């Protein structure tokens, strides 16, 4: 005896939209990632153990607690032959994470040890004055 239409957004609702329209939608996929006869308990740890990993990798990159952030790691045009405005206006995310799937390991090493490791030895030694 209830019912009204959509108001804000849905779960995975932007997953056929462009990047410029999905970038304002990230919180709904951010909230419900964690909450949602032993075999319930074996699920209730894997859902935790996946959440910590994605939380941990943001922590190392100097980017914990923010939803988005930027670094100083330069984008390498060898990774993408796509033009700029095609990416931010035409390609969806689900397609996009089949295209840079191979380069992903190179990316994550080239964030930490490249910059945010280096932005602490530089950071700690800006004292003495």
């Amino acid at each position: 005896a209830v019912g009204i239409g959509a108001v804000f957004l849905g779960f995975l609702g932007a997953a056929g939209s462009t990047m410029g329209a999905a970038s304002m939608t990230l919180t709904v996929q951010a909230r419900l990632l964690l909450s949602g006869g032993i075999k319930q308990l074996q699920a209730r740890v894997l859902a935790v153990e996946r959440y910590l990993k994605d939380q941990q990798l943001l922590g190392i990159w100097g980017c914990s607690g923010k939803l988005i952030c930027t670094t100083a790691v330069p984008w390498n045009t060898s990774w993408s032959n796509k033009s700029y405005n095609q990416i931010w206006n035409n390609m969806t995310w689900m397609e996009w994470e089949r295209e840079i799937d191979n380069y992903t390991s190179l990316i994550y090493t080239l964030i930490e040890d490249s910059q945010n490791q280096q932005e602490k030895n530089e950071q700690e030694l800006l004292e003495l004055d």
Binding site: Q29, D54, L58, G62, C69, T70, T71, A72, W96
Partner: peptide, 17 residues
């Protein structure tokens, strides 16, 4: 399964002192 973490390039850059 959701793989919620992802990266992309742009012109911006972390403030470095």
């Amino acid at each position: 399964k959701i793989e919620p973490l992802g990266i992309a390039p742009t012109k911006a850059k972390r403030r470095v002192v």
